[model samples]
Target: QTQITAQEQNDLNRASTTLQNLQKAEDPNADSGIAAVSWTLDGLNNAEWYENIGKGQLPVYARAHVMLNNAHASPGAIDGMSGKNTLKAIASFQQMNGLSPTGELTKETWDALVAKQNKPAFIEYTITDADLKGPYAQSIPSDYALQAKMKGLYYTRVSEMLGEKFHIDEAFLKKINPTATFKKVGEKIIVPNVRNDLPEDIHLIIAHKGAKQLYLFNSRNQMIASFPATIGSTDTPSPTGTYKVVGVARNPWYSYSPLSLPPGPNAPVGNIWIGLSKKSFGIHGTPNPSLISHGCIRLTNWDANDLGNKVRSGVTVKFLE
Candidate 1:
């Protein structure tokens, strides 16, 4: 006869107790087999929670429980909390989405899930620099030569600034700017005249931080699109000034900085960078969705790519509040 050791007996007893608890809680109609749909601390199962929340398109806390409940190898307990088991589930999700498996809830993961929930549809947008102006105008360097230089080298600085602003990988930036040289201190460069040839009817989209929402409008003042965003953080907060969409790069490489990132995912910035007026700031996508950015506006890679395709160089962008 097979003998059960003390530890094995203890494990069996625990399993028996867990089974009794589940039998008391089981519901035939519920997908989770848990009787109630309402949130519960002890009753939450990670795998069950992950599947259910994923299907419902619910938040992470809820999803964590599903994963805990249904996971095959671990049979991890459902706790509605982010723990090692929960992080493993998150990593599984990330791996499925082709994202870096940092085992944390990030924007890339959220976006992949969102995309899975809502497939992309074609949308048309066009905006020009001339269409962007303000009810609250900040000081813009009006020197024609400076503005011209801004236009001429806008692509260069915009890319650099986009890298810094988005926390992109430096190696990725080098891939994009293989032959280009960034302006050095006190370097003389010509600025091209902007806003002169811009069409008055162009539409522009601006994210007003002071407003806590994005604005989309054409030169005719017609509204186009709007989205909610977590703007900049405190220290390296979004610049309160006027700027322009100088350039856009698609599938851009990222540059990671040690100073900016600590105890976080390595590549937070995703595949695109939308260059702006500020020297080292621009809108871009992030690998880390749960964490807010240093200074620039963070978006999903799809949104960044969409925004890049929607706007062009010399398009005006402004930040307020």
Candidate 2:
């Protein structure tokens, strides 16, 4: 009490107030607390209700996303929503762990996801000067022709790229890290376990045009996992029939019919490109996972890289009706 600083007392009070909210996020039913600060966010906590900070909080969901990611499944972004990406990741975990492919979250999925009990949901990361050094873009162009001018398609910013590296949104990343500044080095920041473990082998990939979903299977034809995808539009419909992966290009500079887009996160094709047997058709990434692609299937950069790393040439890719 005598040694407690004003900041600690303030944090203690906040920690106390947040107990109820914490329970709300963790469980819809959802507190008591010791008003003592051990390790709260550096100094940031006041946030919007929609910050995904409470009752179904972003942090809780982010934790689950990270676990699923590390164990060889991609949840796209750690945006805190249990959307298509999360569902697919959960199903993958269930398949790998021999659980039924319910495609729904359950106690069994969480139990198997944890593997080791009592593990901390998040880990600490320190910013480095090297992390900040970049020939970063001031802004990425949306027009395919405009992007052709850039020599290289690098990241937009240090912190933003760091967010992608960790699979969490930059705002949420800042939320967990109280220091409030990703610009400076030598600061500890909380981040998810975005370290990936690519599935060693994939036998087949099937894209369903009607459902906007892609299914993966092992050599045995058993479903391995799935992904939310963006297929062709009515104007430029995807080819229906069996195809096979031809080649995989990481950080590719797309040569569109009349334009050449540079490589960057904002590139029309995004980061990783999985070329299909059909000419000019591929499974690629989009700047926004939530946005639809023009023709070729689009996935989040995280999932794109995950699939790119695991898939091989000659693997089957069938476009469904």
Candidate 3:
């Protein structure tokens, strides 16, 4: 049997700590009222959302997140953890519905959202043989030079692949399916019911830097979908004004400087690249969501693929400060 490498050992240890933290979060001492809440599939589906629920994450937020995500206003990662990304998505949904954009989850906003897209929050997905037999990378390296030598920058584990496929945070995925092996074929796991379909063809795209979101609109100028984005940082700010979609590529080979990185989910540009008319400027995905881009727009890999698939060349992309 092959022994695990030091890197794998470290990763396993780190994962253990994260799980411990999550367990602590669920403890009665961690957050008031959280312990009283149920986390079962039906319980999470029926959790209540209100304005004054105090701090700490709740199953209600997770349910709302799934609804918002299905409606195409992505809350970044559906962790059930309340943060700026969720608020931003709420505000965008509010604005789209002609309601006040408070960036707060009001009852009216919640009702309206549910009225539009009140699908099930979670679903059962059975593991497949293909899932077990992954052409995964042994590990993704930090150094670009080392990465250039590898065959591809693929996912390192089954959980990660499933998380991306479901547009969920890996930790949260584990939390929801506490008994999941995420290995054996025929093992059923619960996952967020996410949708990638847009209501209509995108006529205009707005990369709102201030909002840290990429908004999509149809020819009627109505908002159809929005995704949380990481635009260019201060050191390398994105260009202002309008641009057009130059092209879109899936599992794109990233060519930057002296390195020509192989295609995969871990590539510098993630799995998809929506090239804009401006040279070297485009909307793409990142290997890490916590990272900022260099004069470009970045989205989660799933979101990038969702947007890329629906959009075509020459669609307008206007940068709004």
Q: Please name the candidate that would achieve the greatest TM-score relative to the true structure.
A: 3
* Order of the predicted models by lDDT, top scorer first: 3, 2, 1
The residue pairs in collision within model 2 are 25-55, 25-56, 42-178, 52-58
Local accuracy by lDDT, each model: 0.39, 0.60, 0.74
Q: Could you tell which candidate, 2 or 3, scores higher by lDDT? A: 3
Ten contiguous residues minimizing lDDT sum, candidate 2: 27-36
| Per-model C-alpha RMSD | 25.9, 18.0, 15.7
Over 30-137, each residue of candidate 1 has an lDDT whose tens digit, in order, gives 322222242222222111313333222122444433322222111122233333334444443443345654544555554454444321111111222322221212
Q: Write the per-residue lDDT of candidate 3 for residues 182-283, one digit (tens) a residue.
A: 778999988888886875478767776666778787665567788988787766656654567879988889886745789999998999999875456789
Worst 10 residues of 1 by lDDT: 189-198
TM-score, prediction 1: 0.31
**Global Cα lDDT for candidate 2:** 0.60
Question: Residue 124, candidate 2: how far off, in angstroms?
Answer: 1.3
Q: Which candidate number maximizes lDDT?
A: 3
Q: Per-candidate TM vs. native?
A: 0.31, 0.68, 0.79
- Summed backbone clashes in each candidate are 32, 4, 0
